[PDB]
Amino acid sequence: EQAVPIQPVAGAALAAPAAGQINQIDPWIFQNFVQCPLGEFSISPRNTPGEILFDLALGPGLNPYLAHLSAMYTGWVGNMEVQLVLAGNAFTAGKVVVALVPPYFPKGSLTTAQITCFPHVMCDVRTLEPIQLPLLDVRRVLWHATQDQEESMRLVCMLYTPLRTNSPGDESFVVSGRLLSKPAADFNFVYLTPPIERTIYRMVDLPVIQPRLCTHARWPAPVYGLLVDPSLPSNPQWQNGRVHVDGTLLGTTPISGSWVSCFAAEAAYEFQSGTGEVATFTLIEQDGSAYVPGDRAAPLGYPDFSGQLEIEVQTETTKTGEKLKVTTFEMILGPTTNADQAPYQGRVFASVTAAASLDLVDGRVRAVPRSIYGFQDTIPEYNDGLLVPLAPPIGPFLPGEVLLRFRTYMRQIDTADAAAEAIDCALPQEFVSWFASNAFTVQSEALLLRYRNTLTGQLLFECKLYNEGYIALSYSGSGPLTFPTDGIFEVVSWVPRLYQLASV
Amino acid sequence: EASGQDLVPAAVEQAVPIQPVAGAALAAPAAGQINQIDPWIFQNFVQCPLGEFSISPRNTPGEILFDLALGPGLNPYLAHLSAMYTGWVGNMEVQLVLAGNAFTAGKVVVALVPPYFPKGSLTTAQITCFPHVMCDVRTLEPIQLPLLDVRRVLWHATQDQEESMRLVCMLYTPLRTNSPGDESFVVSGRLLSKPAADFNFVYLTPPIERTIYRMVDLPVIQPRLCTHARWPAPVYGLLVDPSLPSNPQWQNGRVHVDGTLLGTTPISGSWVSCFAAEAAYEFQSGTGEVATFTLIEQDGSAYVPGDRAAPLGYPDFSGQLEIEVQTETTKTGEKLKVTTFEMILGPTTNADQAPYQGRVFASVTAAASLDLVDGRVRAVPRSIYGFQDTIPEYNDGLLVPLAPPIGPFLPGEVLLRFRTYMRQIDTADAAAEAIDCALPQEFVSWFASNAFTVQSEALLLRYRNTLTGQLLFECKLYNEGYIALSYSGSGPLTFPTDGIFEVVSWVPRLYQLASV
Amino acid sequence: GQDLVPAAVEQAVPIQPVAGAALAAPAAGQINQIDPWIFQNFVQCPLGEFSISPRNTPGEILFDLALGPGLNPYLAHLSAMYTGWVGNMEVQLVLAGNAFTAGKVVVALVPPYFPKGSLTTAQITCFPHVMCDVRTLEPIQLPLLDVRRVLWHATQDQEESMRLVCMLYTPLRTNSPGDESFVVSGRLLSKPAADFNFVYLTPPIERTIYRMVDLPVIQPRLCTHARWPAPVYGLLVDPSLPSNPQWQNGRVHVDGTLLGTTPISGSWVSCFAAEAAYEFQSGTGEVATFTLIEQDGSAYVPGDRAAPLGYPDFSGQLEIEVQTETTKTGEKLKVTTFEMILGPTTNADQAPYQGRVFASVTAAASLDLVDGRVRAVPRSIYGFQDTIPEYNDGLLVPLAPPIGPFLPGEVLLRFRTYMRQIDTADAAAEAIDCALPQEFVSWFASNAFTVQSEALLLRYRNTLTGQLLFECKLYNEGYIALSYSGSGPLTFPTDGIFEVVSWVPRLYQLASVGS
């Protein structure tokens, strides 16, 4: 290893008197250096000194084996050994610094002058053998608990002196670095407990379902194709189909796919001498519950597009025979005024152009889509003309990255053109249900995904699913490009925010 | 020593897989004083503050019989001493007594659960994955268990609760009896404890009476000298009656044991069935004298519709209520009088009331153009006609927040009622009108003023006569503020009113009572 | 008989020694020793000033302090290069009393994790303690031990430690005819005890906690008003003016969290930015509808603030100057004057909380203009009223609370400026007051000060002469108090500098100012 200005740290000798048990680990695990999650970097000649290359915390999460083992224990203590591997040759120059930051040091940005005031080592990019460091358990408690995250010693690596090299004309030269680790001889677990499947160290996974068998999250229809189209706007403001990976629902997106583009309301019918009868809807929750306006633009599932649509309602009439029917209505949602539509407050209006009297009763109805006229990809009007709390736009994307969109075709009544009508979404509803039910723990910023064919095995592309709930692709084309709908998405690993993808 | 040993005796099979744990030796260099406990306390096992339980043949495998957290609250001595310290540390010894009849059969499991294990979900699969002990219910000798202080700090704080080792007992195998005669026995289990050698407290602090351990006590008053919580009358009877509805929705007299006041119940017993309002009068050649009342709090503060169905102390039944109101008349010869008004609080009908904007009406039948002035007044009940034990409409067809109905009850369990009789007008019936409550106002004020800390789920009480010092029955008071007891008969049962209720211990819901 | 029991024994505190570095060394990375001469001198604590008055009642807490590096200026300065600390201290108390004064205080050692409610006078003597007369001429000293459950303490976390609490055991009374305004002064000093050190050597960082608050060296005459874009012209106190105003601008905590619609930049006050849409058909006039956004270009979202940052918080009619693009023959862009209404108005829809503003001009022609983004700045005020305007239709919007909760005899210091008013009758200037001027709103939220007490004692002193003009209390909520019992308004010269003395408790009694 190296001489670092620090004292030895006691592990199990400090924890043993108040531990019920001290548990030993498979001795073959002390003989292998394994790659750490989020432990890689690339240095380029364009990078400037002071960039953080990595920042890692001590704990069972650095080692996949120890992470799996910690599901059947109450606590852990002790230190680790770490290796940094750099890939340069003899014609490079530049320097890197790795320092040991103590558990309670404030979070923020460090300069090159401050990084040298920690216990640290400084390494040239021409180094041949791996650089060996200790990671010690500096703490104020006797042992750590496995199922919560505490403060611990950190390992921070920052570019110190810039890389100076030549390059060919075709590819820029980079210096790659990787960090590996293993437990030291003083490492232990504490108390054998019944294993738990839902652990903070649990990798995210996706349902094994091809997108052609999923459901669209904005319109009640099957997914008919996945694609990318740079010509269309890049940062929409869709209020349905938005979910965090940790399982937080954004906007008005519901859990179930039967709530999309629908609402439940108390309906009062009043015949008017002019156009005809008018039905007033007082909105409530779809499952049956009071609707109080708040942080949401509308009750969950409310349509989030602009246009004129028609709805079908279960209606009970009083005539000379015929208790109940199912009639249609007309509803306006666009920026045309003429109705005072305020879905945010919870009042809507509808009507039908009819003669004679059509008196009915108020009977706890539910409304469903029929068709759309003049549909446009723009936010509806949740107030009279006012503003509402709503979800942020989708993005931002790194330069050379573009959104991947799941597309379906909705019903049309326009007489102008007859080509198609396509509405897109960020994720199908099955992914929404999956993320909302599993409640994963997020590690850094984004997950490297992988689309491949079921039985042939051919890789199609690699993409990035951001924590916000949208998938980005590194594309540089100009015309729309579609993909086969018969593959399966698989999760590879967590990646940092600035991670360039392989192109199409 | 004893008669037939067709039983198990000693369950000396422990070999519990656990290392010894250090106690006060780790804490001494970080405490600023030298403290020690009276050595005689380390000498005998005493019953725990929540050390009674029961196993019945109706219990199913997986049911939790007890779970005790390590700390000063397992010992009455240590619980009383903990009021003068900030801090404890150390181990404990527990004795389990379950020595059931030779005709029974069954098994329990006792496990050592470490700190930070999630509470709630604990199944028959997971219990044996812990260091544990298997016990027969016939076992003659007391079973001895260690409770270790597994921790990652140096000592614990007496006030507030931290994570410590738990001792959990599951029913492993159902309890069944082999005897030919018509009945299955019940096993009555006891828990005793004492501190281990290196147990200690840390820093001497002023002894505060209101502390988390303490103990819930009740006032020493006979029920016949108490006041009713639903009608201003003395308590006249103690009754149980299975025929009456078992889950009523009374809004008065409802108090949580920890102290929280529920429903519309007041602290004082003079607010019950009374109300304060701003009165405005008018005269009509039809109905007569019509008074509109805008209700305000009976202490003179204004009333705002919030999380209560009505202002504090409002009547919570249906009927026609004759009330007396003080009125001032400008006509010569009289200045101040008391008048009787009629109040309609029954079912909704074709009536003219608008409580929505806070105007609630009363009527008086007369012909002469009575002259009266508006003001403020407090109205108290005088009589009831057509009484019905049912909640009145508060928002007139719109739901209002209400206290939950009283319940649930274990099978065979029935509510115990404090009964009083009210003045009423009857057209042709000579009987007295009876109204019941769950707890008299004295207990409501006691719990409101004392602010106790609950421990498990319920309290076991014993009712004892003062004339002979002889116990009448045992009952369960739930944390929700109602008392239940085990009765399987048909006709009503009445009890003497000159006894005293005494607190015995903390018990869980599934505790099986002896039948009365 | 046998023994003699003396009647007069000197006071002392019995202890059992508490281990410091011996407990912590095996799990600390380093154990770092401090300069040995720091162990030899008592030095005033940063929170080390308090007062006793005959208006205080027994059982009032005169002070309380937490063990840690923040009790000593040398230790507070050293703690910026370490991550932790362990060990014990000693504290010294000095009181400036008289032969007139009768009273007793008790100083007690309250352990960590004792419940924080309210101790009474009988319970305070059950802790280890010292009893002190207010007539004492010499200092009194006590030990502060590191009773704890952890191995060491993090420096940047306050955590829970041993406390030192002093309360009034017996009432303060003078034989004088009274009642007078005699105040007993008290000061606290400290030093580390033998077992004390730090834990892990880190880069020295100046923006840490235990960094004493300071103030910019700028005279008030060279500052900016925080509610109107004008230089500050007056410094005054007025008991006749209302005592608890509800200003939404100019509010900031000492820790730097902004309240209300306070902006960082000094060019944002009383201005707004919006997209404008202009309409006129035959006789309505050129009516402009503004959809507001944040002044930096960011979209406005209705949230925890009553309006976009920098919005006016005074009622009246505002006349503003706005750049507009015309398309008539000749001329492309000009600057026009517009009228708008801030306060309540029947039949009018003004909800800047929701982002909708309406303005009008009187036009003798069409003078049609294209739509786009504009920035509107104030130009004139008509009917200026100092009150909260109509933020919503009829609803309650999130607002900053009123100033409050001054002690008896305590009034609010005001920074005064003059606006550009258009009226027809009175030529008197109209004045607007602020609690803290700009350059004080900045210098907050750029420094993350940790307060460690309830009020700051300041000293106003001229630079040319050095004489003290007045002393005041700066509350954590971001306003200043003075002890002024007079009736008429009083003003002060505006060429002084505010100087930070120390941290004080809320009950601290200021010396009276003026007559």
UniProtKB/Swiss-Prot annotation, chain B:
Residues 284-352 are annotated as: Interaction with host receptor CD300LF. Residues 211-263 are annotated as: P1 sub-domain 1. It comes from the Viruses. Residues 1-210 are annotated as: Shell domain. Residues 264-402 are annotated as: P2 sub-domain. CDD domains: rhv_like (cd00205). Residues 211-516 are annotated as: Protruding domain. Residues 403-516 are annotated as: P1 sub-domain 2. Its main location: virion. GO terms for cellular component: host cell cytoplasm; virion component. It is found in: Virion; Host cytoplasm. The keyword Secreted does not apply. The keyword DNA repair does not apply. Keywords: Host cytoplasm, Virion. The shell domain (S domain) contains elements essential for the formation of the icosahedron. The Protruding domain (P domain) is divided into sub-domains P1 and P2. P domain interacts in dimeric contacts that increase the stability of the capsid and form the protrusions on the virion. An hypervariable region in P2 is thought to play an important role in receptor binding and immune reactivity. Capsid protein self assembles to form an icosahedral capsid with a T=3 symmetry, about 38 nm in diameter, and consisting of 180 capsid proteins. A smaller form of capsid with a diameter of 23 nm might be capsid proteins assembled as icosahedron with T=1 symmetry. The capsid encapsulates the genomic RNA and is decorated with VP2 proteins. Mediates virion attachment to the host cell receptor CD300LF. Homodimer. Homomultimer. Interacts with the minor capsid protein VP2. Interacts (via P2 subdomain) with host receptor CD300LF (via N-terminus); this interaction requires Mg(2+) and Ca(2+), and allows viral binding and entry into the host cell. Stochioimetry is 2:2. Bile acids interact with the P domain dimer interface and act as cofactors enhancing virus binding and infectivity. Interacts with host receptor CD300LD; this interaction allows viral binding and entry into the host cell. Belongs to the caliciviridae capsid protein family. This is Capsid protein VP1. It comes from Norovirus (isolate Mouse/NoV/United States/MNV1/2002/GV). The lineage of its organism: Viruses, Riboviria, Orthornavirae, Pisuviricota, Pisoniviricetes.
Swiss-Prot record, chain C:
It comes from the Viruses. Residues 1-207 are annotated as: Shell domain. Residues 208-260 are annotated as: P1 sub-domain 1. Residues 261-399 are annotated as: P2 sub-domain. Residues 208-515 are annotated as: Protruding domain. Signal peptide: none annotated. Keywords: Host cytoplasm, Virion. Residues 281-349 are annotated as: Interaction with host receptor CD300LF. Gene3D superfamilies: 2.60.120.20, Positive stranded ssRNA viruses. Residues 400-515 are annotated as: P1 sub-domain 2. GO terms for cellular component: host cell cytoplasm; virion component. Homodimer. Homomultimer. Interacts with the minor capsid protein VP2. Interacts (via P2 subdomain) with host receptor CD300LF (via N-terminus); this interaction requires Mg(2+) and Ca(2+), and allows viral binding and entry into the host cell. Stochioimetry is 2:2. Bile acids interact with the P domain dimer interface and act as cofactors enhancing virus binding and infectivity. Interacts with host receptor CD300LD; this interaction allows viral binding and entry into the host cell. Capsid protein self assembles to form an icosahedral capsid with a T=3 symmetry, about 38 nm in diameter, and consisting of 180 capsid proteins. A smaller form of capsid with a diameter of 23 nm might be capsid proteins assembled as icosahedron with T=1 symmetry. The capsid encapsulates the genomic RNA and is decorated with VP2 proteins. Mediates virion attachment to the host cell receptor CD300LF. Belongs to the caliciviridae capsid protein family. The shell domain (S domain) contains elements essential for the formation of the icosahedron. The Protruding domain (P domain) is divided into sub-domains P1 and P2. P domain interacts in dimeric contacts that increase the stability of the capsid and form the protrusions on the virion. An hypervariable region in P2 is thought to play an important role in receptor binding and immune reactivity. This is Capsid protein VP1. It comes from Norovirus (isolate Mouse/NoV/United States/MNV1/2002/GV) (MNV-1).
